[PDB]
C-alpha cells in the first residue's frame, strides 16, 4: 500500500466555505489513484483563522474537499494537524518509499529530515520558496501537482 | 444574550473513544442553561493526541460530548481552537459580563486582561494551578463547575 | 456481587424518546458504580405513553438510557416489566442485602414485603407518596438519588 | 568565519578520562583548521560514561580533548549538551552552510531538521547506522574523520 | 559515613552567571555537614539554560557553588547528571539509610523506588508538586531545605 | 540617602582567611539590599592581629566578604579603618537617619555621639556588651543581625 503526502493550502486549493481548488490538481490526484498510490492529504490547522471554529466550518471544507477529489474519480484520505513524524506512522509507510509535496520549506525540510522524498511546487509560495533557498538536497521542483503527477508517474 | 465560556479538560470532563464527562459538570450546563446562558465549550486542538485525527475522530469526540450534554437536557456551543480575543468577536457579548472557566493558568490570565473575570476549578490541573499562583488580581476559586455555576448563578 | 434496584420514572428522570434524566442521578449511578454495586434499573412498562409503543421506540429510550449513563462513565442493567417478585432471582442475590428505591408506594412496600430495604427519593412522586404515608416501617427518605447515594454509600 | 559541528562521541575518538582520539580525527580539525574553519566538538552529556560524573571527571576529559588537538596544532570549541537548535544560537552560522557530522542517526536527522548538512561517518556506529537505514535525503557518507575533511575540503 | 543525596535545583538555589543560594540551605548544609553527614548535591544538566553550555560555564556554576558552602562553613559532594540507580553505586551507601531530598516528582520516585526515603520541599516547584500527587508512600514533606534539616535531625 | 552602618566583627561573622558568615547574617544583607538599602561593612583593622599583613591577605579577607554576599545575592560597601566621624563622610548621611549596628559598646558609644542610631546584636560580644551595660539611651537590642533587619524594616 503505497503513498503520496500532499499539503492542502497553494497545493491542492489556492471565505473557508467559499473553497476552490486548482483545477490541475483533482487530475493530478485521479492520475494517482489509478497508478495505485494513497493520497494523504494534510491540512495545517495553523491557517484556519486562527483557530475559531465550529464543527459545522469543519464539515463544510471536508466535504468540499472530498467531493471535489470525487467529482473526477479520485480518493483521498484526509488528514488535520495542530506532522510527518505522526503520518508515516498513522499510515502504513517507510518514510524512505514516500514522496512529500508541498509549497513550503518547512514541511520539505521537515519530511526529508526522516527519509521522506521532498517534491516543490512553484504554484501559491512555491516560487517564493525556490529563490529564498535552503532547501533539502534532493529536493525536486515542478510547475504545479499535476506536473508531480505526471513526473512522479514515469519511473 | 448571556455568555458562559468554559475550557473542556479538568472542567467538563476528565481515537479516545472512551470519554466521560464529570457528572457535576453536565447538571453544571442544565443549571447555567436554565437560566438563559448560551454556554461555550472551548477546545484546544493542542490536545486531540497531538495532531493525529481524521474526520472520523473529530466527530466521535463532538458527539460524546454533545450526548452528555443532551442527556440532561442541557446545550452547548462547540468551539475548536489551534482564543478568547475571538471568542469575544465571533460572539456579540459583553467580556466584562463573561465568565471564563478553566483549571489552567494560560487561558484565565489570557481571558482577564481583555476584561473577562476568571474563575479557576479545582479538578484536573486545578490544584495545581493554584499553588503554583501568578492569577489575576480577582480570580474566584472554585471545587469544580458545579460549584461555579451554583456560586456564580447568584446574579 | 452487590445490587441496587432503581425505578426509571420519576427516580432518574423527570414523547418517551424526548428522555431527560436529572444529572445528580446520573452522579448517583457512577458513584454507586464506582462503589461496586451492580446497578438494575426497572421500567414500569405502564408508564411508557401509557402502553403505547412500537419497537424503535423502545429502542430509542433504551439507548437514551445508556448513553446517559455513559456519559458520565456509568453502567446499569435494564430491564422491563409488564417485578420485585422476580428481580431478586433474575440477578443473584439476598434481597436483604439489597436497597429498592423509588418514588412509590406499590413497589417499595412490594419489595419490602421480600425483604428489601426500601429507600424513596422525594423527587418526582416523592413529596406526594410521602404525605399519602402508609410507608413500611423501616423506609428511609432522602431529597434525591444523590441523596440516597451519598447516604448509601456508608455501610 | 565558517564553522563545522562535530559529535565527540565515534567520530573523533574510540572512564571518560581513558579517552583517546583517532589520529586521523586529529589531522582532520587541523586541515580544517588550517582552511579557516572553526571546529565545533559537541558532546553528548549522557555519554560521560552514561551520565555519570563529577567536575574532576569532566575537567581532565575536556583537557584530554584540549591536549588532543593541541599535540597537531588544532583548535576546537568543545561544547557539552544534555541540541542542534540551540548550536546554531551560541553560534552565529546559516544551518544552510554547515555541515553535521557524526555516526549516528539522532544527531543528523535533528541536524537534518534545521537545514544542516547532514554527513555520515563510518567510525563507531556509522556502518550500523549505514546499514539500519532511515536517513535524511542529503546525508553524505564518508569512511571516517579524516576522509570527510578530504570530501568537504572540495566545495 | 552517613550521606544526604539533594537535589540542587529548587532545593538549594533560587543562565548561570546569576547562580543564588537560598540563606537557609547554606545553614542546612552546614549544620548537616557537622552531623557528621555528608552532603551530596545532584544538578540535573538537562537545566543548564536546558543544555547549552562550555567548560567556562560548567567551572562558574560549580564555584559559585562550591563557594557558597565554604561561606557559612559546609562541605558538598557535587554530582552531576544527564540517576538514583548510580549515586547509591557511585557512593557506598545502603539507598535505606539516606534521604533523596527535591521539590520535585521526577526524582522523589526514582529514590524511593531503590529503597530512597523520599523527601520533599516545598521551594520551588515543591508546592505545585505536592498539589499533582501521584508520590511514594511514604513521602516526608518539610517547607525548604532549613526545615528538612531540623526534622532530619532527630534521631 | 538610605543607609545601614554594619561592624564586621560579630556581626556578620564567627587566620584572615578562615574567616566565616552566619547565615542569617548573609540573609539579613540581601534583605536589607532588596530593600533597598546600601550596606556598609566595617571592619575595624585594629582587631585583626595588629596590622601584620601585606596586600594578599587583605584582598582575599576582601573577596572573602564579597562571596559570601554574593553567594545570596547581596551587595555591601566594605570599608576598613584605622571613624563614624569618618563614615559620615565617605558618604552622604545624615547620621540621625542612619542605624549603626555591632555587637560592642565603644563602636555603638562613637556612633551615638553623631546622632547615628545604634543597634546591638547579642552574637558574639553582644551577650558581653548588653551586661556591662553603659550603652546609650535608645540602645537598641536584636538577636542577630537576621532578627535586626526585620524589626528595622518597620518604617
Known amino acids: 500500500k503505497k503513498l503520496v503526502v500532499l499539503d492542502r493550502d497553494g497545493v491542492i486549493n489556492v471565505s473557508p466555505d467559499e473553497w476552490v481548488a486548482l483545477p490541475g490538481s483533482l487530475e493530478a490526484i485521479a492520475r494517482l489513484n489509478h497508478a495505485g498510490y494513497r493520497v494523504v492529504v494534510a491540512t495545517n490547522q495553523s491557517g484556519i483563522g486562527r483557530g475559531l471554529f465550529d464543527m459545522a466550518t469543519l464539515n463544510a471544507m471536508h466535504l468540499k474537499m472530498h467531493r471535489a477529489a470525487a467529482a473526477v474519480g479520485g480518493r483521498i484520505d484526509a488528514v488535520f494537524?495542530?506532522?510527518?513524524?505522526?503520518?508515516?506512522?498513522?499510515?502504513?509507510?517507510?518514510?524512505?518509499?514516500?514522496?512529500?509535496?508541498?509549497?513550503?520549506?518547512?514541511?520539505?525540510?521537515?519530511?526529508?529530515?526522516?527519509?521522506?522524498?521532498?517534491?516543490?511546487?512553484?504554484?501559491?509560495?512555491?516560487?517564493?520558496?525556490?529563490?529564498?533557498?535552503?532547501?533539502?538536497?534532493?529536493?525536486r521542483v515542478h510547475d504545479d501537482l499535476r506536473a508531480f503527477a505526471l513526473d512522479f508517474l514515469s519511473k
Open 81 to 139: 494537524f495542530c506532522m510527518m513524524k505522526l503520518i508515516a506512522e498513522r499510515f502504513e509507510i517507510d518514510p524512505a518509499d514516500t514522496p512529500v509535496v508541498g509549497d513550503s520549506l518547512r514541511d520539505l525540510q521537515a519530511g526529508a529530515a526522516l527519509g521522506f522524498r521532498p517534491h516543490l511546487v512553484l504554484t501559491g509560495k512555491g516560487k517564493k520558496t525556490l529563490a529564498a533557498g535552503g532547501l533539502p538536497e534532493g529536493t
